[PDB]
Ligand binder design. Structure first.
Ligand SMILES: NS(=O)(=O)c1ccc(NCc2ccc(B(O)O)cc2)cc1
Ligand code: NI
Ligand SMILES: [Zn+2]
Length: 262
């Protein structure tokens, strides 16, 4: 009998191939999905999302070769998420983005089939499991907040991020990044869609409660061009621009997307 045991976004190792190392891709709970709003059953019993970033302590920003991420002190309930569909408190650990080679693509989730120019993921782990390592092993371990990005009007709360991207151009670079306020990345409304799903990068584990916000945030084509100057490659290796680091929509199968808003 068969016996089973690096990935990227290129043609040879991109999403179409991930299922071969990570057969959970063949599952029923993969992300991202297309959000079909005809079929998204509004639900009144979904509560306001309580985004409590009162005391958020950013630490580092870094280029991991797939994306950039900003990490937070997650030792205390300094930045948490509760309400919406979540049973309990989920503490923020990091945020990262996915984006395109051009403005017409970059988002992971789609809405009635439209792709936005980038998507922001805020990654939270369920405090009752004690840390992110134990949480990552559970069906209700993680909660990701997804925020769409469209081009036009510059986003101010993002300039602090964008001003340092040239210090972390290549894979493995990092910097101290303190006193960054994540609330300056939220849009005004917090109406959301929710469904059970997965990480969108390997290992593609199916323990994620997805919360996608209806309202995108806007950013200047100058800001998102800064995203596009990052490299997938390391210093001294041939240049390969960090673009199109998004997984395409996966089939919803027997799941239903719920809405918080009519
Ligand atoms: N793209 S996503 O679905 O938001 C996604 C979220 C999380 C993960 N991996 C899990 C994970 C946990 C901790 C850190 B860290 O730097 O402290 C990074 C990644 C993989 C994909
Ligand atoms: Ni065996
Ligand atoms: Zn992500």
């Amino acid at each position: 009998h068969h016996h089973h045991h690096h990935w990227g976004y290129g043609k040879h190792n991109g999403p179409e191939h991930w299922h071969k190392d990570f057969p959970i891709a063949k599952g029923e709970r993969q992300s991202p999905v297309d959000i079909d709003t005809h079929t998204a059953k509004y639900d009144p019993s979904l509560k306001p999302l309580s985004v409590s970033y009162d005391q958020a302590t950013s630490l580092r920003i870094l280029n991991n070769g797939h994306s950039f991420q900003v990490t937070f002190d997650d030792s205390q309930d300094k930045a948490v998420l509760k309400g919406g569909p979540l049973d309990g408190t989920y503490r923020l650990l990091q945020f990262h983005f996915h984006w395109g080679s051009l403005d017409g693509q970059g988002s992971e989730h789609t809405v009635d089939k439209k792709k936005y120019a980038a998507e922001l993921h805020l990654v939270h782990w369920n405090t009752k499991y004690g840390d992110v390592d134990k949480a990552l092993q559970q069906p209700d371990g993680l909660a990701v907040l997804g925020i769409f990005l469209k081009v036009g009007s510059a986003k101010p709360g993002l300039q602090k991020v964008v001003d340092v991207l040239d210090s972390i151009k290549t894979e493995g670079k990092s910097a101290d990044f303190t006193n960054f306020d994540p609330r300056g990345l939220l849009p005004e409304s917090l109406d959301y869609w929710t469904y059970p799903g997965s990480l969108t990068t390997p290992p593609l584990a199916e323990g994620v409660t997805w919360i996608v916000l209806k309202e995108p945030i806007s950013v200047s084509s100058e800001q998102v061009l800064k995203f596009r100057k990052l490299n997938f490659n390391g210093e001294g290796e041939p240049e390969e621009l960090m673009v199109d680091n998004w997984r395409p929509a996966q089939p919803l199968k027997n799941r239903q997307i719920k809405a918080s808003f009519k």
